[PDB]
Each structure stands twice: as C-alpha cells, then as structure tokens.
Design a protein around this ligand. Structure first.
Ligand SMILES: Nc1nc2c(ncn2[C@@H]2O[C@H](COP(=O)(O)OP(=O)(O)OP(=O)(O)O)[C@@H](O)[C@H]2O)c(=O)[nH]1
Ligand SMILES: [Mg+2]
Lengths: 166, 310
C-alpha cells in the first residue's frame, strides 16, 4: 500500500526544507530552487500501522505553475505550505486548496500548514488568521517550522493516520 | 552463468540509475535554460544546449533499449515509434487548432529528406516535440498502448516498470515550462508552411475594400518574397524555407479601386509544423487619406503563449 502526499506553496515558503527536516532530521538555510517535481519516500513508524509515504515536492516557481494541477492527480493527501513572515504567500493560500479539491474529490485529505514559525522577525500572519480559513473549508491545520523542527512529525503523524489503509 | 535471479536485482539497479539520471539531466537542462533566459543580450550557451539535447537523446535511447527483443534498427526509440505508427495504420479572430498527435509530429520528421539514419529521425522527433512542448505527452501516449510495450519489452524493463516510468514522464513535464527552438534552429533549410490569417476590423463603416493586398513575413533566419494576396482572401497557408522565429510582417495594397481604404486589426501567422502562433498587431488604416496616409505598414510580431493545458 502506497500513499501520495503533495507539497504546495509559494516560491521559497519552505516546501523542500520541511522534507529535509523529516527525511534526514536537519536544516539547511541556503535556498535551493525546486525544478518541477522531486520524488522522495519514507516509511512512517506508528504504533497501530506502518506504511510508506511517497512524497511529491513540487515547485513554487511561476514557470512551473501550469504543471501543478498535474502533480495533484490521484493524490491521496495534499499538504499546503505557506510562509507566515510574508502576506502575499499567505494571500493566495486558498487558491491552492481550491485547485486541490477541484482536481481531486472530497476524499482527499488536505492540511493547511504555516511554516517559518521559528523567527518572529517580520511575522505578519497570526495563528488565528490561519485557524479561521482552515475552519471554513474541510481542511486540517497545524503550525510548523523547518529551522527549529517545531513538531514537523506531528504534521506527518496525524495526516498519515487520518486515512484508510490496507 | 551463475546468475538466475541475481540479474533480476542487477536490472533493478540499472532501472534506478536511469531514473536518477533522467532527473539530473532534466533538472540541469532547466537550470541551464532558465539561466540563459536571465541575462542574454546579443552563443556560448547555445552550443551547450545542443550537447545537452545530445545527452538527453542518448539517455532516451538507453531507456528504450533496456530489456527488449532488439530490432535491426539502430534506434530503439524510433523502432517503438515506428510500431505505434504502423499499428495505427492497421486499425483503420481565432483560427482552427492543430492536430496534437505523436503520429503527426512523426510524419513531420518522416518527410525530411536529408535525415537518413533511424537515430537522426528520433533525435529530430524529440527536438520537435520539445519545441512543441509535447515530449512528455507524446511518450505518455506512446506508452499508453500497453499491449505494444508488453510485446516488445521484457518484464524487468524500464518502460514496463510502471512506477519508475510515471516519474520519468513527470520529469519530462518540466520541459514545458521553457521555450525551446531546438527544432527550428537546427533545421534551417527545410520547407515549413506558414498559415496566414488577416483579421480585418469588421464594422460597417465606409465601403467594401477594393484594392489588392500584399504581405511579407520575416523571421530570424530569413523572410518571404512579397506575397500577392488574391482579392477576398484573408486566410492562406504558404510554404517556404524555415524563417525561424517570426519577427515582423508587412502588409499593404496598391491603392487600386474606388474604396482603397483598409483597416486590419491584426495579422496572425502560424508555423503549421511547430504550432507556434505569432500575433502581429496593426489597428491602423491602409490607404491615402486615412491616418498618416500609409499604403503599407510594418507589424511587429508577438509569440502567443501556448494553450491549452487540457
Ligand atoms: N528561518 C527559516 N527559514 C526557512 C524555513 N523554511 C524554509 N526556509 C528558507 O527558505 C529557503 C529555501 O526554501 P525552500 O524550502 O527550498 O522553498 P520551497 O518551498 O521549496 O520553494 P521552491 O524551491 O521554489 O519550490 C532557505 O533559504 C531556507 O532557509 C523556516 O522554517 N525558517
Ligand atoms: Mg519545493
């Protein structure tokens, strides 16, 4: 049994950095541009069950914007990631969730995520503002950070358990 | 010899290798090209793109030669193409859109005399698809005839290995986010048909256009002779040596007749082989008395963005 998890967000919000935190428990603050799609898998070890998660790390670049709907096709789970230190990244966050439920049905487990909660320098979005739009649509919510590793596992734990299995 | 099921695991390594390779090359060519589109005022990067495609093609050959009943052909990509082609032979303001089909673009390569090797045909086919932004699509479609891939490839093959094949296609999808002219810029002497479409401002004002119009299309590799358009013809497809990226278009008339006043909104020229469509904004009169009284005007073309994504 395999599980698909798509990672979506604006250019440099922290999609790839969260994968490195969970994959090899480490953080690199140097920016590396994502070119289209990167594939990566890991096996989550939980007390009840244990199955592998195929990760899809998509690009936040506009050049690659027209391909994003294609990356969502047949995706079991979608993980929307937005920076909280920037308003624009948080701005169209909804446009993403909409496209998800537009390509995929309603069975697709979606979860909103506000990354970069490590530094409060220039933070323009609050937990409340994210909680509200996460409550409007049938979508989970959780605060996260890649530099600090603020419960990055929680992001995975509950999203991988909240889904049918073998 | 001392390898019953050991080779099975040895082939899974090769398959992994081909995928990691594909990704790397895909990821590089995109960076090399996006970087070229960053600062270029005129090449050095142009010759690099030729070798990059050189490598992309060999990679594709190796992928297509992995685990199969080798044809006499030198190209495994062209042989699997040829088959899909021969097996379809058995089973038997806006202009009209072009037919999108791996077979179509095959035919385009098939009628290029200078190309003699099966390898060149494939190499030609892949560049044309890259310019058209259909390498991924065409391969995903060539691979849809599962019975065909099954009849040619062993079970441990790359192509037959559907979990790695899907990533393989998903990576070629990146070439759609960049503009390649690798077909147009290398085959500078082939005949290419340009579909012309004159869009007159339809509004009842004045009288019927009576003059004789002429047109002249010009691109980077050359330009057309002066084309004399038949009265009451606003759409025609003209064939001539590859003009490269269309740059400008000039239209006019001989001022003959009673009402020699023409108002053309835009001219649209399209490469019938690549599908590239250029818009040539006009919006001004053509005739003595109107505007600045010009009887011929020069139009600067714009490449229209590829559509759709359906
Ligand atoms: N301070 C801080 N920086 C972060 C955090 N997450 C990501 N970054 C920074 O963002 C940059 C890299 O961002 P990526 O994670 O690769 O961005 P992305 O979502 O993959 O964007 P694309 O590659 O365009 O798709 C680096 O300079 C990181 O230091 C975080 O939680 N805290
Ligand atoms: Mg990324």
């Amino acid at each position: 049994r395999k599980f698909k998890l798509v990672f979506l967000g604006e250019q440099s919000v922290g999609k790839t950095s969260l994968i490195t935190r969970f994959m090899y428990d480490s953080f690199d603050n140097t920016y590396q541009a994502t070119i289209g799609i990167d594939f990566l898998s890991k096996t989550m070890y939980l007390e009840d069950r244990t199955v592998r998660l195929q990760l899809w790390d998509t690009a936040g670049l506009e050049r690659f914007r027209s391909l994003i709907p294609s990356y969502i096709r047949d995706s079991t789970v979608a993980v929307v990631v937005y920076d909280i230190t920037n308003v624009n990244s948080f701005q169209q966050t909804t446009k993403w969730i909409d496209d998800v439920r537009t390509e995929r049905g309603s069975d697709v487990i979606i979860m909103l995520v506000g990354n970069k909660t490590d530094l409060a320098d220039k933070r323009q979005v609050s937990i409340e503002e994210g909680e509200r739009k996460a409550k409007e649509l049938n979508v989970m919510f959780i605060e996260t950070s890649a530099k600090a590793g603020y419960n990055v596992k929680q992001l995975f734990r509950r999203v991988a358990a909240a889904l049918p299995g073998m | 010899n001392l390898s019953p099921s050991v080779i099975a695991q040895t082939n899974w390594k090769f398959v992994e290798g081909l995928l990691k390779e594909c990704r790397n090359k895909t990821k590089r060519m995109l960076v090399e090209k996006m970087g070229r589109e960053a600062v270029e005022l005129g090449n050095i990067t142009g010759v690099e793109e030729n070798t990059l495609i050189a490598s992309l093609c060999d990679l594709l050959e190796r992928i297509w030669s992995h685990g199969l009943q080798v044809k006499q052909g030198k190209s495994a990509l062209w042989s699997h193409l040829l088959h899909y082609q021969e097996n379809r032979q058995r089973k038997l303001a806006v202009m009209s859109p072009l037919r999108i089909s791996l077979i179509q673009d095959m035919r385009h390569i098939q009628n290029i005399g200078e190309i003699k090797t099966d390898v060149g045909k494939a190499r030609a086919w892949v560049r044309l698809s890259m310019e058209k932004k259909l390498l991924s699509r065409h391969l995903k479609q060539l691979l849809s005839d599962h019975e065909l891939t099954k009849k040619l490839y062993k079970r441990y093959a790359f192509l037959r290995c559907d979990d790695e094949k899907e990533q393989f296609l998903y990576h070629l999808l990146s070439f759609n986010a960049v503009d390649y002219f690798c077909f147009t810029n290398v085959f500078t002497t082939i005949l290419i048909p340009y579909h012309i479409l004159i869009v007159p401002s339809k509004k009842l004002g004045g009288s019927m256009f009576t003059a004789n119009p002429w047109i002249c299309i010009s691109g980077e590799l050359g330009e057309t002779q002066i084309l004399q358009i038949p009265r009451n013809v606003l759409e025609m497809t003209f064939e001539c040596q590859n003009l490269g990226k269309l740059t400008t278009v000039q239209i006019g008339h001989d001022n003959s007749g009673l009402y020699a006043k023409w108002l053309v909104e835009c001219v649209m020229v399209r490469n019938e082989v690549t599908g590239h469509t250029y818009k040539f904004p006009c919006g001004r009169w053509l005739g003595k008395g109107m505007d600045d009284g010009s009887l011929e005007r020069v139009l600067v073309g714009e490449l229209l963005t590829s559509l759709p994504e359906v």
